[PDB]
Amino acid sequence: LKDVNHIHPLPDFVRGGFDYVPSDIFSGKENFEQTLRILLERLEFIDQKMVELAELRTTLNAEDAILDEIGRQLGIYRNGLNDPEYRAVIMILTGNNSKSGTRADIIATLKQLFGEDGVTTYKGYNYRLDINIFNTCMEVTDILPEIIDMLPLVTHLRVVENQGY
Amino acid sequence: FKTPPLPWRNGGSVNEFNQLYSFTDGNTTWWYAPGATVSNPVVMRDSPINGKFKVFLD
Amino acid sequence: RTVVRTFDFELSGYPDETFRVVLDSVTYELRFMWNERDESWFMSLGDIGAQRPTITSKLTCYSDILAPYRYLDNVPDGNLYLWPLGDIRTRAGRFNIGPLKGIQMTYSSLIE
Amino acid sequence: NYGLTGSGFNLPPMDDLVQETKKTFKSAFGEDFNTESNSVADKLIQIFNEREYQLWLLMGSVYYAQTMQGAEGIYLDDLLGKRGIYRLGKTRSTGTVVMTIDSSVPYNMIYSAATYTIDTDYELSSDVQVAGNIVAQLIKGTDVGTYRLQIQNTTDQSVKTLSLNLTATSGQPLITFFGQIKDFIVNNTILSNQDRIWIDSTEGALYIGYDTNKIMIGLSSRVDFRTNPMAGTRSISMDVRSIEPGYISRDVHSVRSINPTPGGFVDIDNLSAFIDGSDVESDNEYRIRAATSISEGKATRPAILAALLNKVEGIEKVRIFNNNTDKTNSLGIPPYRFMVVCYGGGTAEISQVLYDTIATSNNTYGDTFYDITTDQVERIWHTKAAARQLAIRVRYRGRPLSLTEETAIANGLATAVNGTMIAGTLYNVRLVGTVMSSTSPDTQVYVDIKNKGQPDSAYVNTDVTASTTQVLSLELEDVIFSQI
Amino acid sequence: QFKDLLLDPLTGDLDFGTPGDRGMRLALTNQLSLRQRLYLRFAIWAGDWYFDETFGFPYRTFVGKKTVKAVLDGRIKSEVRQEPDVLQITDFQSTMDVVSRSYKCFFTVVTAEGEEISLAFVGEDEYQYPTPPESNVQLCGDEGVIINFKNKLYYLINFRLPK
């Protein structure tokens, strides 16, 4: 019924405070109101930017200019990656820390990179595993090094990518 | 039997082995359940045509 | 790290409570401030008569408050937690802190 | 003082800000400036001041958003997202139910999955067939003629048949007929089943999958079994899930109805608490799950060993073997496939547990298989150990043991049922110790062991070892005593 | 706001509920709680409940004796005000019949209603924790941003043409 995240712009900030004019003594004088409005409306701008200072620092929306700072703390350097996929690698490596490389587990990680039906996985008798891609939205060669990391120590892997079925 | 027939009810539970319950759809038939007791009641379902219930003979 | 429960807290709901407590035979002073917009309790910890508090943090349920601060000579080495007595989904409030109000703020000390 | 300090972020009250700004105004226009109550400047300054209180509070809230404590809502995910843990969404309750069916319902009839609802919010998990899902049976009173009995072996896959005649409808002949049926069933499945079937001679009825108090507790696993004259009342086990995801819970004996009543229906009830569904995951249990992730082990030999023993309604024993060098090795195994041996774990339920295996580890060897949907569907393999019963003879010198005093000794040899697959060695010295332990203290004692059915010449003292897929077994009635 | 097991006003037994929702209920509204708090307070004769000799009403003083109507009304009207959440008593029609020797009074009591302080012990929660995203929506965008824009364009094309 209520949002748990209380960090939001204050609703109707301006009309508040004006509500503290005692008994409409000054209201309708058009000389005191403008002086008060001009000062209060400055806080509006500062109040608004208080959110982006917290909202924009999250990894989901962080821009490349500062996303590097988030990656730097985790040891994931930009190298030659671009912004749209640099976000992906950060998620992939971080998610690897609570993984076991099971068949059900592997499907889950690939799920975040290719939608619901964009990926499928065949399995083979002698350590063979196969990955199929149908709806890639980013160039895969640069993402490939991580795709190896979350697999068992002895996996034998093939990678094939195509658009659609 | 006990003479006064009683109406069927989907939310009813029977506990008496000798009373007649008048089911209707106005096709009225009278039903009983010998294996009904206070210790082992039975639930009047949507329809009696589906166990322990038996229809009165005509 | 065996630990034993040894102290419990209660709050009257006044927005600027301040009182002195004794833990592990040492004495500390605590300050609690209520935040309106964030509807949460702010806790400050320090030595008796200290110019400034040593530690300030925001209270939350099932979070180890002292975790990153067990490296100072004036900080308790025990465990401080807030967990609910009722439904597990209830979050810390203003008047719902106490041994029977819904949230059990507790301190426990390691066995040495 | 109240901003950023060496010990975190603080909060200023309103009055301190009011006094500070009033002092600033005083300095602006000398000590004579009025700033209390009646001043227009007072009404402007006080109104102006309260707003920055909100700004300070919000700023203080922002700072803790990036700390182990104080994170909430969306911001909480980022903090714990660094450690690869994500909230759980809406969930659907899962569980199993049983129902008794009238004697007349044919075996081959199959219930349509999409034409029934257990109760206001439960439906069949999938299609269900009566055959192969019998869990308990009750036979009583009304049943002369010729009867056929069928059963699928739980280790092999060969159907077995038995022929009998019910020349009498009561008395010792009926008791013998029931005993013959009991012997027929116990020789297959698992010995634990025999503990849960008996005959109430006082009433001349046979109970399958009940307890001494006449409560249906079920057999050790779903099975198939038939009688050409379909007598008694049969019970089956179904799998049930909720309609829409959310929060819902049911107790051990809650489910009580089915809306569209199928012909021949008798009753329906629960056996154990359902895995209740949940709403959107909250912060508290999110932190709790983040804290207890240490024990979450998978895809390792100790992990797979532990998981099986704690996720199956049975699985008394388990053992694994490895062959990973270019060849089939002595034991018949493909070059790069694991081997798993279990006891009393069923087929489908245990198969689902095997999804903890390391990805790309082929495994998949054994005598029995099953298919599981991931989406794609894949097949897994395993085997069930073939029990081998022993015959034990005890000879001693001393006072004659009295009847009902041999019960302790007989049950004492229950340790013989605790041998492990392959690596099971009796160590007859251990048996001598046990037989001399489960009794009052106090001359001579010996133990002889042989396979069932062999002549008396087969008795020996050397220890016995289980085969590759065999496991030791023993029955109470297969113990004898001799005085010397 | 005193919580307690709900007593049926019509029968006096516990209010297990209607046949469609049979169960157990707690007295939540202040009105229901006060009703039973007065009912029990008046129904238990003074001294007849063990474990508390001081509880109850002393009917034996008046019943069976020649008594003055005015004295009885004072005691009846006084026991009511022992509850800490009684605002006032509106009217009081005390009448006595000498033929049948019966006495019967009427009156009503006014009580306000309070808040619940905390919902931790009762049923539900008031927060709206977020829902995790689905599939590759987070890392690649969402289609709804296209659907809403298309709908806005269509409705704007609809607006300009007079109708």
CSV table of C-alpha atoms in Angstrom, one decimal, chain B residues 32-36 42 45 50-54, chain D residues 265-267:
chain,number,residue,atom,x,y,z
B,32,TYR,CA,-30.8,-40.6,3.0
B,33,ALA,CA,-27.4,-41.8,4.0
B,34,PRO,CA,-27.3,-44.8,6.4
B,35,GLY,CA,-23.7,-44.3,7.2
B,36,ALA,CA,-24.3,-40.9,8.7
B,42,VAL,CA,-21.4,-36.5,5.8
B,45,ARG,CA,-22.3,-31.7,-1.7
B,50,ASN,CA,-22.5,-38.0,-7.2
B,51,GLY,CA,-22.0,-41.7,-2.5
B,52,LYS,CA,-23.4,-42.6,0.9
B,53,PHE,CA,-26.6,-40.8,-0.3
B,54,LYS,CA,-29.4,-43.0,-1.6
D,265,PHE,CA,-14.8,-40.9,-5.5
D,266,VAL,CA,-14.7,-41.7,-1.7
D,267,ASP,CA,-12.5,-39.2,0.1
